[PDB]
Amino acid sequence: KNVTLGVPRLKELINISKKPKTPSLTVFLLGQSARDAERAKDILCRLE
Amino acid sequence: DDEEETYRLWKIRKTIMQLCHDRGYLVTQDELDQTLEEFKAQFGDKPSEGRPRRTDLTVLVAHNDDPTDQMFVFFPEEPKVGIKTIKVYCQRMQEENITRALIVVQQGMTPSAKQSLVDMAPKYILEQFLQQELLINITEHELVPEHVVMTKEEVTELLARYKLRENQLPRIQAGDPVARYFGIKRGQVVKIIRPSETAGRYITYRLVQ
Amino acid sequence: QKRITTPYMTKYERARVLGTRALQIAMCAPVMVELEGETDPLLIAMKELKARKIPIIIRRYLPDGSYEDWGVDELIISD
Amino acid sequence: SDENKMDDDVFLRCIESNMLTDMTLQGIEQISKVYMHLPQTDNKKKIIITEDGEFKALQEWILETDGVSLMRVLSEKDVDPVRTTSNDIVEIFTVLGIEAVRKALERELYHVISFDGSYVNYRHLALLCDTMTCRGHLMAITRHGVN
Amino acid sequence: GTGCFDLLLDAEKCKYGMEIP
Amino acid sequence: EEDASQLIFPKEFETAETLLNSEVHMLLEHRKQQNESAEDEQELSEVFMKTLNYTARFSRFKNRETIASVRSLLLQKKLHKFELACLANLCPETAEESKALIPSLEGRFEDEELQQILDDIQTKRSFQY
Amino acid sequence: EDAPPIDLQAPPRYLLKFEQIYLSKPTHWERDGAPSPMMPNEARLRNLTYSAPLYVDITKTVIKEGEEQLQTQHQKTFIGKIPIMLRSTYCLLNGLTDRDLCELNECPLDPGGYFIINGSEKVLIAQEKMATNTVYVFAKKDSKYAYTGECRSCLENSSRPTSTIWVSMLARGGQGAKKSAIGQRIVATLPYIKQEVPIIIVFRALGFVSDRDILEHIIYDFEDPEMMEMVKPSLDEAFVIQEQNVALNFIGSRGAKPGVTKEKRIKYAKEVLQKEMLPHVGVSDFCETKKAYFLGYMVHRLLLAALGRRELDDRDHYGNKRLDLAGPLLAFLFRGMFKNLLKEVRIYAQKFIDRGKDFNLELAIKTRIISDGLKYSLATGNWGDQKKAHQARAGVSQVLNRLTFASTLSHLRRLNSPIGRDGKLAKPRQLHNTLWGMVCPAETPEGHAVGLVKNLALM
Amino acid sequence: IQRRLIKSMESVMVKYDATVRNSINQVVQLRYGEDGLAGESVEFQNLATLK
Amino acid sequence: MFYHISLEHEILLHPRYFGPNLLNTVKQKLFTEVEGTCTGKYGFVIAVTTIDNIGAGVIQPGRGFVLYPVKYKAIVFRPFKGEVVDAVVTQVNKVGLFTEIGPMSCFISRHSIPSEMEFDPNSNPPCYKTMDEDIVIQQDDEIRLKIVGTRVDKNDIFAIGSLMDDYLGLV
């Protein structure tokens, strides 16, 4: 994953602009699926 | 999908019941941590294409301080909410002589129906809540700090100690999801006890305006 | 329209209208009526009132702030 | 029923493009791709107090996804409603509120500052976030910059 | 002092007239 | 107590609508035409002549159609009326130039969308040669 | 030579033509007027422009409706003067041995190659420009259309102002009842047509009424079906226009100055396509076949890029960029004064012609415009005439840096990146691979203008 | 960025009531840094009653 | 800057003009009083487009002059403080560049000009040119400047500009 950092992100933080460059989101899993790899793929598909 | 609806409706009910508890209303212990397995058992049928509908999902709770201050949580049971249905709900609420009610509107709301919440009499208090918004409990989020509504007595004492005015205190929008969650209006002060890294605990007060 | 003031012209209005018109006539103002050798400006304006030709329009301010536009020709003068 | 002006030939061409462009078989719009990988860093890993007492960080899969759909992503099965946070303050404002943005803004400001190893006192960082959120809504830093 | 009424000039009535000179 | 950068000025000018340098030339030409021939009056004041040359020299548009198209194009956006004439009159080459010259634009306009607006003005403004 | 004929009328017809141009070596004209030689060193000391006189032969034919044509010869008319670059063919220090240069107080090691204006040595900084008569396909994500068929076309050295046409291809992002069906269609914008007209209609205006001929010029390989399907949607928009006259009428409808009468629209479209459009391929009235083939190639180039079988042209590729030196630069400038020179002669004669008396040429030709016109920009640095209501290109003809000999050499070989849309869209600052052996990579001024200014490679 | 940040916080100051307020006198923070201590005298240390 | 406004002006009409169609005299008079002048509050009134309406003519007591309040549409040139606008140079002196912003004249001080610029007295014509000579400002040159302040003098507006701000100059 490419996450914009440095000046480009610092500007966007003070610049409240509605559309950032790479507005990524981190998804944290819970329960049994949080440990298994295959069980996390279905979540990946249902989010993508 | 019928199976998807069970989880979608179950989350709304679970969050809605917790909403009253956070507000300050008396809520039964079992209804707060009610499980999904019990959601189907206590209805006895599948919600979609079954006897369990959104009309019977209405719940009635009473304020802890006084039982006469009951609260309503109505469900339109329709893809879109119009003026005619809204007039019925408050008219229905008139018989029970209640002052506050909650409407769990679907993703779509008629723009004309939105005006019903603005032209209502001062004693009418209708708060709109989108279906998507109530699927998750905003309060339990780690980023969201603990919010406590300050009574009028505390507000006057608070300003006297700090010698502050209403404008000097930090402002918070009335349309904020947290403000809507607590159902607070203008002139109300919310106590925010956040876990500050430096001092551990830091109490902040924000005025709704 | 809807004018409630008296149709007749008051003496004060007549005096001011002739005086203002006479001053205007003395300032190379045109004369609607025919000139038959009347040199004195007051006489020129006096006959103008008789013939109902004075362009001046009287705006009577009522005590309540309203105003009524009464024409000199419309008003009934006394001769 | 419709069979019995683009009757059926031109209409099929028109409908064909539509279903190959704006048809979502499964997923949420504005999400291009999802990155799944075990986080080696401690901050991403969940820290839970053990029975003995010593802190332990278990291995939990994290799915970093491009785009912001926090309102819908959070309301999903097998997704943590607590630790799931986005890097977009604007999205957080409309979902969690201005108060949550103050912490999110702090994390993003600290994340970029700490990326190169530099450190800044928390008090200074907190002051910037408080001023922006002092009025209850996100405020762009004063752009005049005279001083 | 004779101020309850004001004289106003009207152009429509002035549309007729010839200068003496 | 008034400053154009901060969009502070007498309240009277709020109702007024701004005009382009090229557009004003048309209005001046209309005023010039009637005075020259329609009525026999004194020659136009030196102030009128001075601004006529300024508008003609800085006229960025040929005909009314080009002026109207730019006016309509910029009206669709949330551009303030003060910026409406100022942007067209200045004709910034790029978005970066406009923001530095016009501090107000940078408040509510992004570096990308505004660039798509200035380049449109470039396609409308034409050269004598 | 390529100047348009000068015609004056108000029975008395005057036709003035320039036969030949004579250039003499630089001389200084004092109050006495003697043509004394003007050494380059004297120019710097006296703070005067180093330049040479310009002479033109003017032949005028006058007919007074009397069926009697007579003409007079004007030998070496003093049209004006032209600044002379040092050490050039017309310079006073060409082919001179090192011994002679010292006698004239000039450094033999000095390479020259600059202009002395008002005692200031100025070097014409080369300005990179997009190459002409070349088809380029670029991809822009901000435009409403997916691909750009940009191709700026100009004749030899310069007969008319450069004209550029963008044969664009609408993007698939848009959705509509009919747009989705046909999908992606090609639209071409003419230089004098405000709206984007379909490219297919253009060929119909040329004379290729048959639809098969349109595919023949665009699609060379009929066996390949991938390209054929792409051109199908473009035909749908232009299908209703079957006759050539209708196509000419269609184009003239959106013209800059549409004609009041119907027949005028066809004439305006005919002139635009014949003259304004694709001047380089053909300027006469019998180049319809040649013009169509080039137009089809532009579409064909677009098809390859759209399908991905052809790589998109690189913006920073120096092969796609041309360098304008003192020669090409001054050539464009010379047209500005010369064109104004004809206007001054025409305007001066206009009042004379209507009165019926002949007008002397000595007064008609203006020396100041030719002399001051070139001297102005070369001194100020603002390219072009100041009277014309536009923005001059600054940064050209900067004062030669004489602090060090190496600096002087670098300044003369200095290069400038393109400015405006071309430079902005590309990345002139970034170092490209094409600079190997052509532009020095290390050499570049430090600051905000880093990489915009460079230096020519030694060889 | 440096100039922009200073302008937005130029008027921010600590008053005599141990509160952070701007020129308008609006309370930005009840206590400076949420603790009421200077950022220069503070020293880094690790309390050993949690690990 | 050019604006479209609706102004009020009390027209003093002599009794000599009380003849046929005096409104024409009032209408034509307005084309001389507010036309070509420079009010200190709304700036130069370069031209008048049309007349909105003409109010009732009130006769002033004693004076005998009828007062006609008339509303008209006109375009003014009001230079707002701290506004950047193109200008035309009319003359150059050691004190600084003298510019011309439409009807008015704006003066640029030497200090306001960037330090890199240096006045050259001999160069014919004079023009503020820096040592690098990349940019030069000759007479009748289109330059962009920012008006730091404006002052009203003898019923005229005099403006003071500067070029210290970025992107101010020939461009």
Structural domain count of chain F: 1
Contacts 24+ apart (CB under 8 A), B195-199: B195/B145, B196/D126, B196/H34, B196/H35, B197/D122, B198/D122, B198/D123, B198/D126, B198/H33, B198/H34, B198/H35, B198/H37, B199/H31, B199/H33, B199/H34, B199/H35
The token duo for B5 is 């609806």
Sorted by sequence, the CB contacts under 8 Å of residue I143 that are 6+ apart come out as: I86, I87, I89, I97, I99, I137, I163, I168, I169, I170
To one decimal, the resolution in angstroms is 3.8
Report which residue type is found at G356: G
Give strand ranges (E) for B35-133. Answer: 59-63, 70-74, 80-81, 100-105, 108-109, 125-130
Q: Cβ distance G397 to G123 under 8 Å?
A: yes
Q: Do B199 and H31 touch (CB under 8 A)?
A: yes
Strand-pair category, I2-13 with F17-18: antiparallel
Q: Round to whole Å and give the CA distance between H32 and H21.
A: 10
Q: Cβ distance A26 to D36 under 8 Å?
A: no
I33 touching chain F per CB within 8 A: no
Q: Do H34 and B198 touch (CB under 8 A)?
A: yes
Contacts of D22 in chain G (CB under 8 A): 175
Q: Cβ distance G149 to G157 under 8 Å?
A: no
Chain I window 54-113: which residues touch C at a Cβ cutoff of 8 Å? 56, 58-59, 64
Contacts of C29 in chain I (CB under 8 A): 15-16, 18-19
Contacts of G178 in chain D (CB under 8 A): 6, 10, 14
Q: Round to whole Å and give the CA distance between E4 and G203.
A: 84
Tell me the CA distances in angstroms from F93 to A7, F100, F120, G389, one per residue in order: 25, 12, 11, 16
Q: Which strand ranges, in their side-by-side order, compose the sheet holding I117-118?
A: I117-118, I128-130, I136-137
* Residue spans of alpha helices (H) in chain C: 11-26, 41-51
CB atoms closer than 10 angstroms to residue G72: 10
Q: Round to whole Å and give the CA distance between I161 and I152.
A: 15
Report which residue type is found at G148: T
Which residue, D40, B130, D103, D77, is CA-closest to A27? D77
Q: Round to whole Å and give the CA distance between G338 and G268.
A: 28
Q: Round to whole Å and give the CA distance between H19 and H28.
A: 8
Touching status, chains G and E (3+ beta-carbon pairs under 8 Å): no
The token duo for B58 is 């209405």
Q: Do E9 and I26 touch (CB under 8 A)?
A: no
Angle at which helices G199-206 and G244-253 pack, to 10 degrees? 130
Structural domain count of chain C: 1
Q: Give the distance, in angstroms, between the CA of residue B200 and the centroid of all CA atoms in the same chain.
A: 29
Q: Which residue carries 């007579």 as its tokens?
A: G70
What is the least distance, in Å, from the CA of G182 to any CA of chain D? 7
Tell me the CA distances in angstroms from I87 to G421, I123, I162, I170, one per residue in order: 25, 22, 12, 10
Q: Cβ distance H29 to D133 under 8 Å?
A: no
CB atoms closer than 10 angstroms to residue I49: 13
C&E contacts, CB < 8 Å: 53
Q: Which residue carries 């420009």 as its tokens?
A: G129
Query: What are the sequence ranges of the domains in chain B?
Result: 1-136, 137-209
Contacts of I59 in chain E (CB under 8 A): 6-9
Tell me the CA distances in angstroms from I91 to D55, G390, I30, one per residue in order: 79, 20, 35
Among positive and negative, which fits the CA dihedral C65, C68, C69, C75? negative
Q: Which residue carries 């500050």 as its tokens?
A: B196
Q: Which domain holds residue F95?
A: 1-129
Task: For I146, name the nearest residue in chain F, comparing CA atoms only.
Answer: F101
Tell me the CA distances in angstroms from G397 to G29, G123, G404, one per residue in order: 25, 5, 19
Q: Which strand ranges, in their side-by-side order, compose the sheet holding D85-86?
A: D34-37, D62-65, A25-28, D85-86
- Smallest Cβ distance to D147: which of H10, H12, H20? H10
DSSP G71-86: EEEEEEEEEEEEE--T
Residue G82 pairs in a beta bridge with G52
Mutate to test the interface with C, among E7, E9, E10, E20 (most CBs of C within 10 A): E7
Give strand ranges (E) for chain D. Answer: 34-37, 47-49, 55-57, 62-65, 85-86
Chains in contact with E, where contact means 3 or more Cβ–Cβ distances below 8 Å, are: C, I
- Smallest Cβ distance to E11: which of I23, I58, I59? I23
Exposure of G297 in the CB half-sphere (CA atoms within 13 A): 13
Q: Give the distance, in angstroms, between the CA of residue A19 and the centroid of all CA atoms in the same chain.
A: 15
Tell me the CA distances in angstroms from D79 to B13, B181, D101, G30, G100, one per residue in order: 19, 22, 21, 93, 90
Report which residue type is found at I155: N
Q: Round to whole Å and give the CA distance between D44 and G115.
A: 67
Report which residue type is found at F64: R
Tell me the CA distances in angstroms from C65 to C59, C62, D144, one per residue in order: 12, 6, 52
Sorted by sequence, the CB contacts under 8 Å of residue D89 that are 6+ apart come out as: A13, A16, D101, D104, D105, D108, D138
C&I contacts, CB < 8 Å: 26
Q: Do D127 and H20 touch (CB under 8 A)?
A: yes
Which residue, I166, I101, I94, is CA-closest to I128? I94
Q: Which residue carries 């009951």 as its tokens?
A: B70
Tell me the CA distances in angstroms from G360 to G74, G94, G364, G365, one per residue in order: 11, 38, 7, 9
Q: Round to whole Å and give the CA distance between B204 and B192.
A: 5
Task: For G424, name the nearest residue in chain F, comparing CA atoms only.
Answer: F94
DSSP G395-444: T-SEEP--S-HHHHHHHHTEEE---SHHHHHS-SSSPPGGGTTTB-SS--
The token duo for I136 is 């030069």
Q: Round to whole Å and give the CA distance between G276 and B121.
A: 71
Task: For G181, name the nearest residue in chain D, comparing CA atoms only.
Answer: D14
- Smallest Cβ distance to G390: which of F56, F115, F127? F127
What technique was this entry resolved by?
cryo-EM
H38 touching chain B per CB within 8 A: no
What is the least distance, in Å, from the CA of A37 to any CA of chain D? 7
DSSP G52-75: EEEEEEEEEEEE-SSS--EEEEEE
Q: Cβ distance C48 to C36 under 8 Å?
A: no
Q: Cβ distance F124 to F59 under 8 Å?
A: no
Q: Round to whole Å and give the CA distance between F90 and I84.
A: 9
E&I contacts, CB < 8 Å: 37
Exposure of B89 in the CB half-sphere (CA atoms within 13 A): 30
Q: Round to whole Å and give the CA distance between A38 and A44.
A: 10
How open is the CA angle D63-D64-D65, to the nearest 5 degrees? 110
- Smallest Cβ distance to F128: which of G142, G389, G421? G389
Q: Do E4 and C30 touch (CB under 8 A)?
A: no
Rg of chain I over CA atoms, in angstroms?
Answer: 22
Q: Round to whole Å and give the CA distance between I106 and I80.
A: 13
Q: Round to whole Å and give the CA distance between D54 and D41.
A: 19
CB atoms closer than 10 angstroms to residue G121: 21
Phi and psi at residue G352, to the nearest 5° = -75, -40
Contacts of H1 in chain A (CB under 8 A): 7, 10-11, 14
H5 touching chain A per CB within 8 A: yes
